[PDB]
Amino acid sequence: TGLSKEELLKVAGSPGWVRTRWALLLLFWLGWLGMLAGAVVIIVRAPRCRELPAQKWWHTGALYRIGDLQAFQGHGAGNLAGLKGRLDYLSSLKVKGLVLGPIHKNQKDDVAQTDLLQIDPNFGSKEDFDSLLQSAKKKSIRVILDLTPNYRGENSWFSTQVDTVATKVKDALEFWLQAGVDGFQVRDIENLKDASSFLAEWQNITKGFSEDRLLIAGTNSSDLQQILSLLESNKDLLLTSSYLSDSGSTGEHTKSLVTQYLNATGNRWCSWSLSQARLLTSFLPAQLLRLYQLMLFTLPGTPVFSYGDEIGLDAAALPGQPMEAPVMLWDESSFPDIPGAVSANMTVKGQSEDPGSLLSLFRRLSDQRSKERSLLHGDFHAFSAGPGLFSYIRHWDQNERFLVVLNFGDVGLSAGLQASDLPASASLPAKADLLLSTQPGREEGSPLELERLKLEPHEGLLLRFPYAA
Amino acid sequence: GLVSACGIIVGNIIGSGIFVSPKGVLENAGSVGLALIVWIVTGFITVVGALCYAELGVTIPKSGGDYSYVKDIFGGLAGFLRLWIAVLVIYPTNQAVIALTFSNYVLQPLFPTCFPPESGLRLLAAICLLLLTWVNCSSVRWATRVQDIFTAGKLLALALIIIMGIVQICKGEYFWLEPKNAFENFQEPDIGLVALAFLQGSFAYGGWNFLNYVTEELVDPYKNLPRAIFISIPLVTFVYVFANVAYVTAMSPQELLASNAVAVTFGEKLLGVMAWIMPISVALSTFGGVNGSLFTSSRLFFAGAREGHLPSVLAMIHVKRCTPIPALLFTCISTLLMLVTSDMYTLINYVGFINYLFYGVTVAGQIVLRWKKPDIPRPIKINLLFPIIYLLFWAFLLVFSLWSEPVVCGIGLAIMLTGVPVYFLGVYWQHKPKCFSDFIELLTLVSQKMCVVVYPEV
Ligand SMILES: CCCCCCCCCCCCCCCCCC(=O)OC[C@H](COP(=O)(O)O)OC(=O)CCCCCCCCCCCCCCCCC
Ligand SMILES: CCCCCCCCCCCCCCCCCC(=O)OC[C@H](COP(=O)(O)O)OC(=O)CCCCCCCCCCCCCCCCC
Ligand SMILES: *[C@@H]1O[C@H](CO)[C@@H](O[C@@H]2O[C@H](CO)[C@@H](O)[C@H](O)[C@H]2NC(C)=O)[C@H](O)[C@H]1NC(C)=O
Ligand SMILES: *[C@@H]1O[C@H](CO)[C@@H](O[C@@H]2O[C@H](CO)[C@@H](O)[C@H](O)[C@H]2NC(C)=O)[C@H](O)[C@H]1NC(C)=O
Ligand SMILES: *[C@@H]1O[C@H](CO)[C@@H](O[C@@H]2O[C@H](CO)[C@@H](O)[C@H](O)[C@H]2NC(C)=O)[C@H](O)[C@H]1NC(C)=O
Ligand SMILES: *[C@@H]1O[C@H](CO)[C@@H](O[C@@H]2O[C@H](CO)[C@@H](O)[C@H](O)[C@H]2NC(C)=O)[C@H](O)[C@H]1NC(C)=O
Ligand SMILES: N[C@@H](Cc1c[nH]c2ccccc12)C(=O)O
């Protein structure tokens, strides 16, 4: 071996080695206090993280307007009880709202006979409504009932009366909230006498019953000065207007149309929708329909969609249908009036299995809106780009940043995005791995360069880049 | 007498691996219902694994355990590589993971939704390590009388996950677990990403192999030691499943993958007072995982030096107190080298690959000792077709983990291939370098003088 001895060591060890054994024993114990104070200084010099805002249920996800119950599932199975079977489909969409149509037995312009407390017998009863609310509560889907009283007449809110129709609504606020609906909507508030002071009485009883309730109000006013006069008294009101219903096919228009709305309201919580009760197939063609679903799901606010929006259900395609309430295309026999009129991709059954369809873009965007912290309440900072295109950054404190580049032109335009107009906390690097794109033909997950970004016509692409230093 | 022995096995198996694993099991298996299968399959494999280790402990009984079983079957080369890995790879990176767990869990209340600093974890984990090796070297009676303090912490913490878990079972909080229809997630992970969920599911079960040869004190073995395995290790799998059910009744599975500390994200919910005792009762559990792994790190430097390998400057024992200094100074230098480099969850894949690789060659040694050398007195036996289930599970996991992450397993096999030149310099060398061999004598006596340590009597 290599031993010395026990006894031979102690007569040879430590004549002056005891000086080096004490001095090196303190050099360890002094460097450990330098490693202890040097590890508390790093924690304090590490800055902070931001406190998460108090998120309500409509802040996290999208709502889903269901106008006509009989046309959502079909005239054979059209009931409130038949709506319960489709709750498994909407939970795949990961929507959080169920803003269903008014069901309060209107009598076609007779103010004394439209009681808002009593459900129409053509839809069901009281007992199937609460079990619909009990069934939706297990899947965490919130049901919003709207109380626009004259919904089958040519003008809502009963133009011959000014006061009895108003207290007909106010009595029904404390009636349906007993049954536990999680909000209310009032469409067409442009046809009201003293509209901006009647929402403030209705948002009292909606918030005063419980804090987790909401009120939605719909106009058709597309002017900026009319909307802000409605939001100058109330603040926590979702107002779905017709503000974006114009063309916006030039790129610098919609950049100047969206960033004027957040700048005038002071970056509050808004709701992004192209209309109040109309689909996205109106107001814009079918090649920009995948470009707006990427825009509406990434803007700061609650995106509101109508039924048949995820599949691009055009009312002007199938003949013999009312324009406001088209039939939802469930299977090949969902429209049994004209045989041989629907395609395979023009059906929610064929849209589901196609990995490059339009429903596959909705479902792949709806989960990333609902689960990602930088899209839930991340800051919005749009910046300049080339001749016509829209580009903006969604960013939060430390989370995964997002960068959307939307091209509204028709030529294969290069992006040319300049990062000089950003704050230093959320600047972009040279590489950012792609996440999704509207038209396929790009390698997803591949980190591409952000200076040479050649873009196709009608091609909006979603990139992400991590927090760096 | 058996009930006293069952506590010996469950006490050292259950440590701070239940606090690290369920983020990495859920990330690699995808769904919640597939992750609860992984904790059941791994616990059955450990029962199969700790059975075939008990048969070699009654057939060829020698001190050293895992290292001496390979020493009997091609024991020249293969026996040294079992100990070359357990000195550089296994024992350092088992302490660095538990040390990095300690800094990650005390810096979850501070910095709850942001990220902790990248060098505030490499310096707070090196403080738990460098303090404990100072405690460990010193009067070893101190190092065991403090270990039942850390054992009370992991019993207080794992009880609180259970009793607050079972309260949420008798409520409406059984949404994600009990429904059995919420079992869908990212399926682009292949089978090869489920193989990485077994590299991290058995980090929580690790520490079963060097226990069974210690239970020697047992009464009448050859029937009991076994009867003890069939009671202890399925009682670990009962706890690890029930404490993982309680993790998902508190938070979302996507919420579980975001936090760096799973046990205290549980604690910031379900009461307001458990924000104070969820970091404390789990940072105590990570103190015992490093303190309990610096006892057993020095028992392997003893068995290696008396057999030719591992030159005799190691395995020396201090003159006033029975403590090995230079065996603890090699698992403290080599642990700091593994600590500053890489990420914790990809360090478990670095252990669990090479830990399975020598798990197999001892069970393969249990079958080749039945082909070669029969009629040896064996007090207990298993089925002939029983350890070939373990070799079936070992082969289908090793080649799939090499396909998934080849870089973290390519450096695990690169250090084993570094073993064959240092072994051939080790014992197959002619002793004609007179100018080089007295360097070893000069290296020893200077280490024997600046440290007063001496070889033991035997
Ligand atoms: C801290 C700096 C950053 C980290 C750097 C790594 C530090 C590793 C330290 C590990 C923990 C050390 C604990 C020492 C105290 C033990 C406590 C105790 O019970 O003492 C008993 C015993 C008490 O002695 P007594 O007071 O005489 O009774 O302590 C000793 O006898 C010696 C203590 C000092 C040990 C000297 C170690 C010198 C290492 C220098 C290496 C130089 C290069 C070598 C190259 C080799 C190439 C192969
Ligand atoms: C740092 C901790 C200090 C306290 C502990 C001191 C430990 C010192 C040795 C550490 C390594 C222990 C394992 C040694 C290898 C074991 C294999 C074996 O069986 O050996 C038996 C063999 C014979 O032992 P014997 O039976 O006791 O004579 O022991 C040795 O030959 C030890 C050789 C020391 C060097 C090991 C290999 C170093 C690799 C790096 C080479 C660098 C080349 C020069 C580069 C430039 C330098 C300027
Ligand atoms: C309901 O809204 C009104 C404002 O529209 C709030 O203020 C009340 O206003 C009425 C006159 O319209 C006064 O008679 C009340 O005394 C006011 N209430 C006060 C000062 O507390 C009213 O606070 C709202 N209700 C709740 C519960 O907040
Ligand atoms: C909102 O819809 C109405 C219905 O067509 C538009 O027309 C208004 O209709 C009411 C009642 O029929 C009249 O009292 C108004 O004078 C009409 N407006 C105009 C400008 O003539 C109304 O224009 C639509 N709102 C917007 C902003 O286009
Ligand atoms: C939109 O935001 C900009 C700055 O963020 C502000 O616009 C300023 O409006 C005043 C009004 O006369 C001009 O004098 C300034 O030159 C404008 N600023 C810039 C940079 O052009 C304002 O906060 C918002 N605009 C409005 C009309 O409120
Ligand atoms: C579903 O796919 C079919 C492909 O067969 C599309 O049909 C083509 O549509 C374009 C105009 O959109 C026509 O110019 C082609 O002649 C059509 N081809 C055939 C074979 O009919 C159809 O447009 C797709 N559906 C939707 C809603 O876009
Ligand atoms: N070191 C063991 C695992 C391990 C050690 N200590 C632990 C404590 C608890 C859980 C697991 C462990 C291995 O390499 O497999």
Side-chain angles (χ1 to χ4, degrees), chain A, chain B residues 1-172 179 182 189-458:
Chain A
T1 65
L3 276 59
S4 281
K5 166 189 290 304
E6 165 152 3
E7 312 156 289
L8 162 76
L9 183 141
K10 296 177 81 174
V11 312
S14 51
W17 291 74
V18 60
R19 205 79 68 98
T20 62
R21 203 170 317 120
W22 275 0
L24 202 140
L25 260 182
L26 307 190
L27 177 138
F28 165 74
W29 210 244
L30 194 85
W32 191 80
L33 270 299
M35 207 178 274
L36 183 55
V40 172
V41 159
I42 286 180
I43 295 178
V44 170
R45 278 185 64 244
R48 205 56 263 167
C49 22
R50 191 162 159 106
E51 184 144 320
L52 299 192
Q55 288 280 95
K56 320 285 195 163
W57 64 265
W58 62 91
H59 285 53
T60 69
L63 316 175
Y64 195 83
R65 293 181 301 223
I66 298 180
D68 214 348
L69 293 176
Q70 273 198 358
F72 181 50
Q73 57 256 19
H75 286 240
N79 265 310
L80 273 155
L83 171 57
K84 196 161 53 181
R86 296 306 200 275
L87 269 293
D88 283 88
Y89 160 71
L90 313 159
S91 46
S92 78
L93 271 68
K94 304 188 162 277
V95 296
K96 323 263 170 181
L98 210 53
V99 193
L100 54 91
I103 51 174
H104 49 247
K105 57 167 302 297
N106 194 272
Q107 204 40 50
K108 199 49 154 55
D109 306 359
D110 187 311
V111 185
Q113 292 284 338
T114 75
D115 208 336
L116 302 200
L117 319 179
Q118 174 174 334
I119 320 185
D120 192 305
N122 284 331
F123 287 96
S125 67
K126 289 278 182 64
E127 289 93 345
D128 47 352
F129 182 62
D130 60 82
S131 46
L132 163 67
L133 261 66
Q134 280 180 199
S135 158
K137 200 176 289 172
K138 265 275 160 184
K139 298 184 178 69
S140 88
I141 279 172
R142 267 59 166 247
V143 168
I144 301 169
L145 165 67
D146 62 335
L147 298 181
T148 293
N150 199 18
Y151 63 98
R152 43 194 64 243
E154 65 181 2
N155 176 36
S156 316
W157 301 102
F158 290 131
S159 62
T160 195
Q161 299 270 26
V162 303
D163 56 354
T164 295
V165 61
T167 176
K168 187 64 65 68
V169 176
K170 187 248 188 183
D171 269 14
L173 263 287
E174 69 175 78
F175 188 84
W176 293 106
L177 281 170
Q178 293 287 108
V181 285
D182 214 282
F184 287 98
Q185 192 193 27
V186 279
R187 283 181 302 117
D188 288 343
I189 62 164
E190 74 262 23
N191 303 148
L192 281 173
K193 307 308 166 208
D194 192 1
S196 44
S197 317
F198 262 115
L199 297 173
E201 195 177 314
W202 291 335
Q203 211 201 344
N204 260 2
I205 323 169
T206 298
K207 290 286 179 164
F209 201 91
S210 312
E211 201 72 41
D212 47 308
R213 267 71 195 262
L214 86 166
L215 192 86
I216 305 170
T219 74
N220 70 333
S221 298
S222 161
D223 280 317
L224 195 53
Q225 307 307 310
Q226 195 161 331
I227 297 166
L228 271 62
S229 277
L230 273 158
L231 307 174
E232 81 182 49
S233 315
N234 302 113
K235 284 297 162 57
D236 213 7
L237 185 74
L238 288 179
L239 194 137
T240 77
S241 67
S242 177
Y243 168 68
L244 304 105
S245 296
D246 310 328
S247 75
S249 314
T250 176
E252 66 261 12
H253 206 250
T254 319
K255 168 197 296 199
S256 315
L257 191 144
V258 165
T259 71
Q260 266 185 16
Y261 189 51
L262 304 166
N263 188 25
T265 42
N267 288 100
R268 270 195 303 275
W269 199 259
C270 56
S271 68
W272 295 107
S273 42
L274 271 293
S275 163
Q276 47 154 358
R278 213 78 79 85
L279 296 98
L280 294 203
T281 70
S282 316
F283 299 103
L284 55 98
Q287 64 266 21
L288 295 183
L289 205 151
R290 317 185 77 193
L291 196 66
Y292 270 75
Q293 293 202 354
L294 179 51
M295 171 189 275
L296 290 202
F297 269 126
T298 54
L299 280 170
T302 299
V304 182
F305 291 96
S306 186
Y307 79 101
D309 206 326
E310 55 264 20
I311 75 184
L313 165 62
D314 178 23
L318 276 303
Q321 185 71 19
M323 187 66 202
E324 272 283 346
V327 283
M328 177 59 145
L329 305 176
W330 290 111
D331 51 40
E332 293 287 330
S333 87
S334 88
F335 183 46
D337 288 330
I338 299 311
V342 308
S343 165
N345 46 354
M346 208 202 301
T347 301
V348 81
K349 184 168 180 64
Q351 282 273 325
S352 42
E353 60 193 57
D354 189 311
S357 89
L358 178 58
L359 183 46
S360 52
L361 188 68
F362 199 95
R363 262 170 182 151
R364 213 188 150 197
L365 278 163
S366 191
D367 55 338
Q368 290 206 328
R369 170 61 170 81
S370 300
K371 86 196 176 45
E372 167 64 41
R373 196 159 271 170
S374 159
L375 288 199
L376 282 178
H377 50 274
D379 290 357
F380 168 84
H381 273 86
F383 60 97
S384 178
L389 69 158
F390 190 26
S391 66
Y392 55 96
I393 296 179
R394 299 299 307 275
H395 62 88
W396 187 221
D397 213 359
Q398 298 280 101
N399 279 251
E400 191 47 43
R401 279 99 168 87
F402 278 75
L403 187 145
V404 186
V405 176
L406 305 162
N407 190 282
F408 279 91
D410 48 353
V411 192
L413 167 59
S414 67
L417 57 91
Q418 271 96 357
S420 286
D421 279 7
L422 273 303
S425 315
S427 185
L428 55 91
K431 313 172 45 154
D433 42 54
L434 201 144
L435 193 37
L436 61 96
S437 158
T438 53
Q439 318 167 305
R442 279 185 185 270
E443 187 163 350
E444 294 173 354
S446 66
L448 48 90
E449 63 287 348
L450 285 187
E451 52 94 16
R452 273 173 294 107
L453 190 51
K454 328 290 148 200
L455 209 49
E456 304 185 24
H458 305 154
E459 178 89 2
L461 83 170
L462 170 74
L463 306 107
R464 58 160 144 190
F465 55 95
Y467 169 67
Chain B
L2 182 48
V3 293
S4 64
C6 287
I8 316 299
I9 323 162
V10 66
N12 315 306
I13 284 185
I14 310 193
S16 67
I18 195 47
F19 305 126
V20 184
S21 302
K23 175 173 174 179
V25 178
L26 202 48
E27 198 197 320
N28 294 265
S31 89
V32 187
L34 188 48
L36 291 196
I37 298 312
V38 160
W39 288 92
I40 290 176
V41 168
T42 302
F44 168 74
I45 285 302
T46 299
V47 169
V48 174
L51 266 183
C52 319
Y53 262 82
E55 315 292 350
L56 293 172
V58 298
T59 290
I60 50 186
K62 266 163 196 47
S63 49
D66 206 313
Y67 160 73
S68 308
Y69 300 152
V70 181
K71 203 78 192 316
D72 304 359
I73 303 108
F74 207 81
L77 179 60
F80 176 69
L81 269 62
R82 174 70 194 102
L83 179 135
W84 176 260
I85 294 312
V87 159
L88 305 188
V89 181
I90 294 296
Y91 271 135
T93 55
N94 279 146
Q95 298 147 20
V97 166
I98 304 178
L100 283 163
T101 305
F102 163 69
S103 77
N104 283 18
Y105 283 34
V106 72
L107 304 193
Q108 189 85 342
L110 293 93
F111 315 100
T113 46
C114 54
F115 295 145
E118 70 273 15
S119 163
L121 311 174
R122 314 282 172 183
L123 294 193
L124 207 57
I127 274 170
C128 167
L129 189 66
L130 285 172
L131 168 72
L132 274 196
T133 71
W134 176 88
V135 171
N136 300 0
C137 300
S138 180
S139 198
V140 156
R141 190 195 194 178
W142 266 348
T144 77
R145 284 192 161 199
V146 77
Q147 222 270 341
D148 62 297
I149 297 312
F150 303 146
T151 320
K154 90 192 166 47
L155 261 295
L156 177 54
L158 257 170
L160 278 189
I161 302 180
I162 287 310
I163 54 184
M164 292 300 161
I166 198 55
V167 163
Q168 278 200 315
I169 300 295
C170 48
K171 264 180 201 184
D190 270 318
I191 289 295
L193 219 59
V194 193
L196 300 190
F198 285 115
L199 292 195
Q200 311 194 292
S202 86
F203 193 86
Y205 284 93
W208 50 269
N209 45 356
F210 42 73
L211 254 60
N212 313 136
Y213 74 68
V214 70
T215 190
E216 253 134 13
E217 217 259 303
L218 218 187
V219 59
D220 313 357
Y222 298 27
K223 79 193 73 239
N224 264 164
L225 188 163
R227 217 205 293 255
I229 298 299
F230 282 170
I231 304 302
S232 196
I233 308 182
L235 182 147
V236 186
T237 307
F238 274 17
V239 163
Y240 280 176
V241 160
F242 291 162
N244 217 321
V245 158
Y247 280 169
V248 81
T249 63
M251 65 189 85
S252 158
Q254 283 298 132
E255 194 165 314
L256 203 155
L257 301 186
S259 50
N260 278 303
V262 197
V264 68
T265 304
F266 179 87
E268 74 175 40
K269 270 83 74 175
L270 270 75
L271 277 176
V273 64
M274 299 175 321
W276 195 66
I277 60 187
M278 272 295 113
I280 289 302
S281 279
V282 183
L284 285 184
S285 176
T286 55
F287 263 123
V290 189
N291 182 228
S293 160
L294 283 151
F295 290 110
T296 82
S297 79
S298 65
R299 290 172 191 158
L300 193 136
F301 284 110
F302 292 156
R306 73 195 184 206
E307 282 204 341
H309 325 100
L310 251 53
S312 198
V313 53
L314 313 175
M316 283 212 201
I317 290 194
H318 181 275
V319 293
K320 287 283 166 295
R321 37 201 172 208
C322 295
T323 89
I325 288 94
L328 292 178
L329 299 200
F330 208 68
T331 52
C332 187
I333 292 303
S334 161
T335 313
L336 289 183
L337 293 191
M338 300 275 155
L339 176 131
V340 308
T341 70
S342 175
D343 178 30
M344 178 217 290
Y345 279 98
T346 191
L347 220 55
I348 309 185
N349 300 342
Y350 176 58
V351 191
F353 167 74
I354 202 75
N355 224 339
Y356 287 167
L357 204 144
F358 288 114
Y359 275 3
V361 311
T362 65
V363 188
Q366 206 261 334
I367 310 174
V368 74
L369 196 64
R370 301 216 160 163
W371 173 257
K372 195 160 193 157
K373 208 188 299 179
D375 278 328
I376 304 310
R378 299 160 179 154
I380 40 166
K381 278 195 285 184
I382 53 171
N383 204 326
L384 323 171
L385 291 83
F386 203 89
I388 204 154
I389 300 188
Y390 196 94
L391 214 65
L392 192 147
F393 181 71
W394 170 74
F396 283 166
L397 203 168
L398 205 77
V399 70
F400 274 73
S401 178
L402 268 172
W403 192 250
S404 310
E405 220 166 340
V407 53
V408 80
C409 306
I411 52 175
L413 286 179
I415 187 170
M416 165 187 312
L417 182 152
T418 325
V420 284
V422 66
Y423 175 73
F424 270 27
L425 174 148
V427 302
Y428 273 12
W429 68 304
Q430 178 52 264
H431 310 274
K432 77 176 173 70
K434 186 156 292 314
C435 299
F436 291 159
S437 180
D438 50 358
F439 187 83
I440 302 296
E441 278 271 75
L442 194 145
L443 184 153
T444 302
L445 59 94
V446 176
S447 158
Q448 215 168 330
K449 277 195 287 185
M450 71 179 182
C451 189
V452 75
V453 77
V454 168
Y455 202 96
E457 188 258 337
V458 194

